[PDB]
């Protein structure tokens, strides 16, 4: 039955593999990436008419009937995302009259206008002079002076926020303005009667910070700020030191863009770092067949390769398959062997983790490291020495990264300060990197592949963490994947792997929860709205990936020979395309709960294959 | 008569011009460049068999009958240069037996062996483990803490020395050792009875520094050096900030190589600065027609283009010659507009100088700036706006650079501290950048082209400087060119240009001195020995360049219609080749008096053309 499904899925995956031996699906987000790029180009005075065109096609193509843009496909209109697209288009050439611009304008106005947008949006506009800098939360270069153990020092922030802060402190220090031509001025963004509904700091704003901001904005106005020249250089140097190999910073869009703007402010356009930073951009861009062009928020080569391998193995291919070896070798060359920012909390920990993108040595993450090390543990490579060695280095690094509560974060250890969540500036997504259930799960499943069971203290401290986090309905939150189906699947699968008993109550309470959300069509689906409204937990159109996740939770919990189980397998079998792949018009990936969503192009092919491979194992 | 000579010279130069519109002759030095490169490759574990080959042919080809190598062609054997070439060859494959190895070895031993070599040589060997680090003058990272105005702070050193110091402080801080394979160990460098004759600090060693060093080497042996981590990062950052656009550092061999070694020490081989730094090297290499390969100590594109233009103009071509325009435009795009290290002494001075090499924004020099601004002042470019503007910016930058004594230095203002000349480490070439007669001359000649005569206070302060520097026999030292003929020619030519009276006594006392050295063959020549032994001042085989220099001094001083004058013109007319150029088997360029000499490939063609162009003007 499914065998033909599985067989076609395999050969399909194998066809996507690149020559070098890795997999790499494009990462999907939203138009703010491309829109901000257009503005970045204006700032850097490097506008390519041809590119602007491909960018306009993409922007329009993404706009919906109502004239808005959302974070995820089929999501509510987003003000920020729409404002930035509006300005972007207007700059490229669209007149405020044209149908598309008209519809957008309405929605923006009906929302309170520009005054209701997140800090970033108002800041970008501030950069081109369409909004007063005085009204933008201030972040001073001086933050660079705070010591390792002090409130708000830059190591209290999550890796992704950190670099962005450092880069912006230089920008906000000089508060530069790169004027748009009259043709693109967007005053109309203010023309609204609706009361401005401003978003506040992620965790509530204490009058202290509010005060501190006003203070900083006044200090900004002074004629002489002592030790600021130093403060700036401290930031610039912090940047120059960490620049990624591909010319980016952290391998993510934000800091990268701001870092380039910072170097531009400092007349360093003829510096190696800026040049490399600029041309490195092209690697993230993507030519769309319909004439458009998009920019990836980040890239997932290592991640894709890691899961690809685990899926093809669980699916059947030999641990020494010559095609899976191309991958295994490639992964060994990726391992990071130098201290990253994580070392600030673990100076005696030996390097050995892996990153998400291609070349990002200073920021490996526990998730990639766990999946990559685990994947390697399922292969038989020519040089058994390097495989044995690589796994051990990574394995040890993972252990040494375990946080206090017994779970694992992504990039740091105990990055749990609650302090930064109240600053005015921080009103978008996560700003700290605390332990999460999904990462912790992947780690346990990784250790489980080696054997290490509930006997080892590390495993127990973690399982304790998971048990305490389990939700009332027996489900588990999904931090980096949408959502409860993603988390529950991860945990149950992991717990099964570390020896724990699948018969326990909490495991059953979970398994039941999964069967209880199986859509009519046999599959499972969870809409990104489940982060905003609990009524959507486990609800949503069925997707290949999410179906596969709920399916793994069941297979793992013993209910592989169930109705719900066989039903779900049927779904994947029927919905499969002729080439062997699957389709998935919805996002199943999470960047920041309720704020930033991602589309993992490979998920739709890899997880169904993995789930089917594990089902075939159950018989 | 000469018209045919000049006509041929012109078409020849015009044929050497590159497409972009600039001239660029290879810069010649000595085998330490290539020899050190071989070792650099060993350190960085990046050895290319094919390249080592081309390097061996070059090394051998340069060795002389006696089996030694010199700084300049036809110079005495040099111990340092010979020791490094010896080790280099041995590493590439030569056995200590072979003829070349045998002769070299002897000369080395008859000199006291490895213990008589300069610091650098013993350091390089120290780097590969063929010499104890303990015996190498120590330079600590901590030097990074000294403030702007303090003894031995890094801004008291000359630009070329500064970067080298910073880079090495990181190296010497870790004192790394990259072992050579047994096959290449060079113990035989010690096997000598001759007493080791060690070279001391450029200006004499006070027992203080001698003690201080011993102190540092002791402090080096301790188990904990507080704030050293910080000292290092201060150096690393200092470097990262200043890296040149081509990936070099200063556009010179030394710091560039050491900076790469430093980054290697700090596990930063995957960092952008290193990559760019490594691949930028190829631009300086040169394929030799006989199968060899040499590395340029530095490159002179701007410099060559600058003189090339001035010569072709003084020769006759129109100020709007479409070919000289390609050059004029090219030169405008080179002007530096950002603060360099010079700004540390002139914060309110607006950028506008030019550099020697292609892309080196942080280190413009008064010499290039003067010759380039002057050369532009002799052209008629399409955009008379940018020409007018550029000249102004450069002009002003020159003025603001003028030192205290009224003369100009190369890279800095009043870089005259006598302190650094006594440190143990500093036993090779110049370490400070004080004002010099030749640069000062070129500056005055520049201003002169505009008009600014002896009326202007600036000019006078300088002329006073020159008058006070003139030597007893009426000659002027040659800092960046060999030698008294170089300086005297410069000065007298300049003085003539700033209105001064050529009839004055000191001018005549100079003019006579010139005539008094005209070799029998009608030309002039000065051997590089004139820096070591005063018996050679104005003495040496005749060369096209030096002949043209003495010839300019005469033409400038009114004695254009003289015997010596017409005699010299004859020389150039005859010695000229059929293609139009000239030959010059001798070095007429100076890096560091008595320590480092250079061969300016274009000098032989450009100066004779310029001299003949100015002679044609005298009639
Ligand atoms: C499934 C695997 C999970 N791994 C992949 C992770 C790397 C992907 C998240 O990547 C991004 C990309 C862009 C942003 C921002 O826009 C942003 C917006 C605002 C600020 Br302030 C900063 C950045 C954010 C994150 C991680 C656990 C290891
Ligand atoms: C005629 C024009 C005059 N200009 C040409 C200048 C650029 C040429 C000198 O360039 C070099 C090249 C190599 C070295 C060292 O090897 C060195 C050895 C030991 C140490 Br310590 C440091 C460097 C040094 C200098 C200057 C006045 C503007
Ligand atoms: C530059 C001094 C070399 C000593 C520093 C190496 C050890 C520092 O521990 C790591 C601290 O966390 C920051 C890491 O990001 C690395 C880039 O900085 C460059 C290498 O020092
Ligand atoms: C990064 C703070 C901005 C202050 C820089 C203004 C320039 C101050 O003059 C310092 C002169 O030293 C030469 C430095 O240029 C090299 C790169 O440093 C980066 C920005 O100047």
CA atoms within 13 A on the CB side of B378: 26
Our CA dihedral for A411, A17, A254, A83, rounded to 10 degrees, sits at -130
3 state SS of A91 = helix
The b-or-e profile of A374-409 (16+ CB within 10 A means b, else e) is bbbbebebeeeebbeebbebbbbbbebbbbebbbbb
Beta bridge partners of A592: A596
CA–CA–CA angle A142, A143, A145 (5° rounding): 70
Q: CA-to-CA distance for A538 and A151, rounded, in angstroms?
A: 39
What token pair was written down for B453?
């005569």
Reduce the DSSP state of residue B119 to 3 states and report it.
helix
To test the contact with chain B by mutation, choose from A145, A242, A270 the residue with the greatest count of B C-beta atoms within 10 A, namely A270
Crossing angle of helices B49-62/B32-43, nearest 10°?
160
List B590's β-bridge partners, or say none: B597
Interstrand relation of A293-295 and B285-287 (parallel, antiparallel or unpaired): unpaired
**Residue of A367, A368, A412, A595 marked catalytic:** A367
Report the run of H or E that residue A286 belongs to, with start and end. Answer: strand A285-287
Give the Cα separation of A469 and B159 in Å (integer): 61
Cβ–Cβ below 8 Å for A272 and B243:
yes
Q: Is B11 exposed, middle or buried (0-12, 13-18, 19+ CB in 10 A)?
A: exposed
Contacts of B338 in chain A (CB under 8 A): 267-268, 270
DSSP string, A299-310: --HHHHHHHHHH
Task: Kindly report whether the peptide bond that precedes residue A375 is cis, defined as omega within 30 degrees of 0.
Answer: no
Contact B477, B469 (CB under 8 A): yes
Count Cβ atoms within 10 A of the Cβ of residue B48 and give its class: 0-12 exposed, 13-18 middle, 19 or more buried: exposed
Q: b or e along B217-228 (b: 16 or more beta carbons within 10 Å of the residue's beta carbon)?
A: beeeeeeeeeee
- Chain B closest CA to A273's CA: distance in Å? 7
Contact A267 B241 (CB under 8 A): no
Distance A155 CA to ligand 3 centre (A): 14
Q: Which two tokens stand for residue A12?
A: 């399909």
Of the candidates B367, B412, B427, B527, the residue annotated as catalytic is B367
User: How far, in Å, CA of A519 to CA of A541, rounded?
Assistant: 8
Q: Which chain A positions have a beta carbon within 8 Å of B337's beta carbon?
A: 267
Write out chain B residues lying below 8 Å of A247, CB-based. Answer: 272
Quick one: which H or E segment has residue B600? strand B596-600
Using H for helix, E for strand and C for coil, what is the string for A2-21? HHHHHHHHHHHHHHHCCCCC
User: What is the rounded CA–CA span in Å between residue A36 and residue A41?
Assistant: 9
Q: Nearest CA to CA, how far is A245 from chain B (Å)? A: 5
DSSP result, A591-611: EETTTEEEEETTHHHHHHHHH
Residue A355: count other Cβ atoms within 10 Å of its Cβ. 26
Closest CA in chain B for residue A266: B338
Of residues A207, A239, A260, A263, the one with CA closest to residue A341: A239
Closest CA relative to residue B25, chosen from B612, B610, B598: B598
- Give the C-alpha separation, A550 to A543, whole Å: 11
What is chain A's percent helix, strand, coil content, to nearest 5?
Answer: 55, 5, 45
Give the number of C-alpha atoms closer than 13 A to the C-alpha of residue A41, restricted to the C-beta side: 20
Judging contacts by C-beta atoms under 8 Å, the chain A residues touching residue B271 are 243, 245
Distance in angstroms between the alpha carbons of the first and the last residue of chain A: 13
Which DSSP symbol is given to A222? S
> Cα–Cα distance between B508 and B493 in angstroms, integer?
13
The sheet carrying B596-600 orders its strands as B27-28, B596-600, B589-592
Q: Is the CB of B343 under 6 A from ligand 4?
A: yes
Question: Could you tell me if the CB of B364 is within 6 A of ligand 4?
Answer: no
CA B339–ligand 4 middle distance (angstroms): 7
Cβ <8 Å between A247 and B272: yes
Structure tokens at B605: 């063609």
Pick the CATH number of B27-298 from 3.40.50.450, 1.50.10.20, 3.90.1200.10, 1.20.120.1200: 1.50.10.20
- Which stretch of DSSP H or E encloses residue B590? strand B589-592
CA distance B543 to B525: 6
Give the β-pairing of A596-600 and A589-592.
antiparallel
Check if the beta carbon of residue B585 is closer than 8 Å to that of residue B535: no
Tell me the technique behind this structure: X-ray
| Cβ of A161 less than 6 Å from ligand 1 | yes
Domain segments of chain B: what residues?
1-26+299-619, 27-298
For B211, the token pair is: 């003690």
B237 as an active site residue: the answer is no
Taking the CA of residue B130 and the nearest CA in chain A, the distance in Å comes to 29
Largest alpha-carbon pair distance within chain B? 77
Interface of B with A (CB under 8 A): 236-237, 240-241, 243-245, 247, 267-268, 270-273, 275-276, 337-339, 359, 361
Confirm or reject: Cβ of A341 under 6 Å from ligand 3: yes
Place of tokens 């319909």: A290
User: Which among A409, A333, A316 has a CA at the least distance from the CA of A372?
Assistant: A333
Q: CA–CA distance from B580 to each of A5, B309, B324, B584, B611 (Å)? A: 79, 17, 19, 14, 15
CA distance A376 to A333: 12
Q: Counting every residue, how long is chain A?
A: 619
Q: Tell how far the Cα of A146 is from the centroid of ligand 1, in angstroms.
A: 25
Q: Is the separation of the CB atoms in B154 and B165 below 8 Å?
A: yes
Q: Are B382 and B397 spatial neighbours (Cβ–Cβ below 8 Å)?
A: no
Closest residue, chain B, to A247 (C-alpha): B272
Q: Which residues pair with B295 in a beta bridge?
A: B285
DSSP for A240-278 reads HHH--TTS-STTSHHHHHHHHHHHHHTT-TTSHHHHHHH
Alpha helices per DSSP H over A110-200: 119-127, 159-174
Measure the CA–CA gap between A430 and A202, rounded to whole angstroms.
8
The dihedral through the CA atoms of A301, A304, A307, A310 has a sign that is: negative
Nearest to B445 by CA among B366, B389, B510, B379: B366
Structure tokens at A184: 């693109």
A167: which residues sit within 8 A by CB, 6+ positions away? A235, A239, A249, A255, A258, A259, A261, A262
Q: What is the resolution of this structure in A?
A: 2.8
Q: How far is CA A310 from CA A314, A391, A615, in A?
A: 6, 15, 14
The C-alpha angle B301, B302, B307, rounded to 5 degrees, equals: 100
Please state whether the peptide bond connecting residue A483 to the residue before it is cis, i.e. omega within 30 degrees of 0. yes
d(CA B503, CA A474): 105
**Ligand 4 contact, A232 CB (< 6 A):** yes
B560, containing H or E segment: none
CB contact under 8 Å between B272 and A241, yes or no, is no
Radius of gyration of chain A (CA): 24
Architecture of domain B1-26+299-619 in CATH? Alpha/alpha barrel (1.50)
HSE (CB half, 13 Å, CA atoms) of B385?
Answer: 1
Residue of B124, B137, B356, B432 with the most ligand 2 atoms within 8 Å of its CB, for mutation: B356
Question: Which is nearest to A554 in space by CA: A611, A506, A596?
Answer: A611
CA distance A132 to A141: 20
Output the six-digit token pair for B548: 């043209």
- Token duo for residue A77: 């209109």
CA separation for the pair A115, A57 (Å, rounded) = 28
What residues line ligand 2, using a CB cutoff of 6 Å? B 160-161, 164, 252-254, 297-298, 303, 356, 365, 367, 410, 428-429, 480, 591, 596
Q: How far apart are CA B276 and CA B264, in angstroms?
A: 13
Q: Do B359 and A276 lie within an 8 Å CB cutoff? A: no
> Nearest Cα to B437, choosing from B405, B389, B412?
B405
Q: Answer yes or no: do B241 and A241 touch at CB < 8 A.
A: no
A344 lines ligand 3 (CB under 6 A): yes
Instruction: Kindly report the nearest CA distance between residue B310 and chain A, in angstroms.
Output: 29
Which of A38, A116, A27, A125 has its CA nearest to residue A77? Answer: A116
> Do residues A475 and A537 lie in contact, with contact meaning Cβ atoms separated by under 8 Å?
yes
Q: Which of B440, B455, B352 is nearest to B402 (CA)?
A: B440
Question: Would the CB of A362 count as within 6 Å of ligand 3?
Answer: yes
Contact A284 CB / ligand 1 (< 6 Å): no
| Ligand nearest to the Cα of A338, by number | 3
Atom of ligand 2 nearest to the CA of B428: 19
Q: Are B522 and B585 in contact (CB under 8 A)?
A: no
What are the tokens at B155?
A: 């801004």
- The nearest CA of chain A is from the CA of B344 a distance in Å of 14
Coil, strand or helix: which one is B400?
helix
Q: How far apart are CA B399 and CA B452, in angstroms?
A: 12
The string of DSSP letters for B245-260 reads: TTS-STTSHHHHHHHH
SS3 B354: strand
Contact indicator for A123, A167 with CB cutoff of 8 Å: no
- Spatial CA neighbour of A83 closest among A51, A45, A118: A118
Helix, strand or coil, per DSSP, at residue B497: helix
* Cα–Cα distance measured from residue B559 to residue B486, given in angstroms and rounded to the nearest whole number: 18
A599, A75 contact by CB (below 8 A): no
Three-state DSSP string of A465-503: HHHHHCCCCCCCCCCCECCHHHHHHHHHHHHHHCCCCCC
| Contact between A240 and B240 using a beta-carbon 8 Å cutoff | yes
- The two structure tokens encoding residue B200: 């001391």
Decide whether any atom of ligand 4 lies within 6 Å of the A240 Cβ: no
Tokens of A159: 């890796």
Nearest to B378 by CA among B331, B452, B335, B328: B328
Encoding tokens for residue A588?
């199943």
B90 touches B112 (CB < 8 A): no
Which residue from B439, B400, B432, B399 is spatially nearest to B416, judged by alpha carbons?
B432
Instruction: Choose, out of A147, A238, A240, the residue to mutate when testing the contact with B (most B CBs < 10 Å).
Output: A240
Residue A568 burial (CB < 10 Å; 0-12/13-18/19+)?
buried
Query: Cβ(A162) to ligand 3 under 6 A?
Result: no
B497 close to B557: Cβ distance less than 8 angstroms: no
């Amino acid at each position: 039955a499914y065998a033909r499904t599985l067989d076609r899925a395999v050969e399909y995956l194998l066809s996507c593999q690149k020559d070098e031996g890795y997999w790499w699906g494009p990462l999907l987000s939203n138009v703010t990436m491309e829109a901000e790029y257009v503005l970045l180009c204006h700032i850097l005075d490097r506008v390519d008419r041809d590119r602007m065109e491909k960018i306009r096609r993409y922007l329009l193509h993404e706009q919906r009937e109502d004239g808005t843009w959302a974070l995820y496909p089929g999501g509510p209109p987003d003000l920020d995302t729409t404002i930035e697209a509006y300005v972007a288009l207007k700059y490229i050439g669209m007149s405020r009259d044209e149908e598309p611009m008209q519809k957008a304008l309405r929605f923006i106005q009906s929302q309170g206008g520009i005054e209701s947008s997140r800090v970033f949006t108002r800041m970008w506009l501030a950069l081109v002079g369409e909004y007063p800098w005085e009204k933008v939360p201030m972040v001073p270069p001086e933050i660079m002076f705070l010591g390792k153990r002090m409130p708000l020092n830059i190591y209290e922030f999550g890796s992704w926020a950190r670099a962005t802060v450092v880069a912006l402190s230089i920008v906000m220090s000089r508060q530069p303005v790169f004027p748009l031509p009259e043709r693109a001025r967007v005053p109309e963004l203010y023309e609204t009667d609706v009361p401005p509904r401003r978003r506040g700091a992620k965790g509530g704003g204490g009058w202290i910070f509010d005060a501190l901001d006003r203070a900083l904005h006044g200090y900004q106005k002074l004629s002489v700020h002592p030790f600021r020249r130093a403060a700036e250089i401290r930031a610039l140097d912090w940047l120059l030191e960490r620049q990624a190999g591909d010319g980016s910073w952290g391998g993510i869009q934000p800091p990268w863009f701001y870092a380039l703007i910072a170097l531009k402010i400092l007349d360093m356009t003829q510096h190696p770092a800026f040049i490399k930073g600029w041309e490195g951009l092209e690697l993230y861009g993507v030519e769309l067949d319909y004439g458009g062009w998009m920019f990836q928020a980040s890239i997932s080569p290592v991640w894709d390769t890691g899961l690809a391998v685990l899926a093809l193995r669980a699916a059947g291919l030999p641990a020494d398959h010559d095609r899976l070896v191309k991958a295994g070798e490639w992964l060994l060359d990726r391992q990071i062997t130098v201290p990253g920012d994580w070392a600030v909390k673990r100076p005696n920990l030996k390097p050995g983790g892996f990153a998400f993108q291609f070349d990002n040595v200073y920021y490996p993450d526990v998730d990639d490291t766990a999946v990559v090390v685990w994947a390697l543990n399922t292969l038989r490579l020519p040089d058994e020495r390097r495989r044995r060695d690589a796994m051990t280095k990574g394995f040890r690094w993972i252990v040494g990264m375990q946080s206090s509560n017994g779970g694992w974060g992504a990039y740091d250890v105990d990055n749990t300060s609650d302090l930064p969540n109240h600053i005015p500036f921080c009103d978008f997504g996560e700003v700290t990197d605390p332990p999460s259930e999904d990462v912790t799960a992947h780690v346990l499943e990784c250790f489980g592949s080696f054997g290490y069971d509930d006997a080892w203290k590390v495993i127990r401290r973690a399982v304790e963490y998971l048990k305490r986090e389990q939700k009332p309905d027996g489900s588990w939150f999904g931090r980096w994947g949408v959502n409860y189906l993603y988390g529950t699947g991860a945990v149950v699968s992991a717990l099964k792997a570390v020896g724990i008993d699948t018969r326990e109550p909490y495991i059953q309470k979970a398994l039941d929860w999964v069967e209880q959300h199986q859509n009519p069509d046999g599959g499972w689906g969870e809409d990104c709205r489940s982060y905003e409204d609990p009524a959507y937990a486990g609800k949503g159109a069925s997707t290949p990936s999410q179906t596969a996740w709920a399916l793994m939770a069941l297979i793992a919990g013993g209910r592989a020979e169930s109705e719900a189980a066989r039903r779900g397998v049927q779904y994947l079998v029927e919905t499969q395309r002729p080439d062997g792949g699957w389709d998935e018009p919805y996002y199943t990936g999470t960047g920041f709960p309720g704020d930033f969503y991602l589309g993992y192009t490979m998920y739709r092919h890899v997880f169904p294959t993995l789930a089917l491979g594990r089902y075939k194992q159950a018989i």
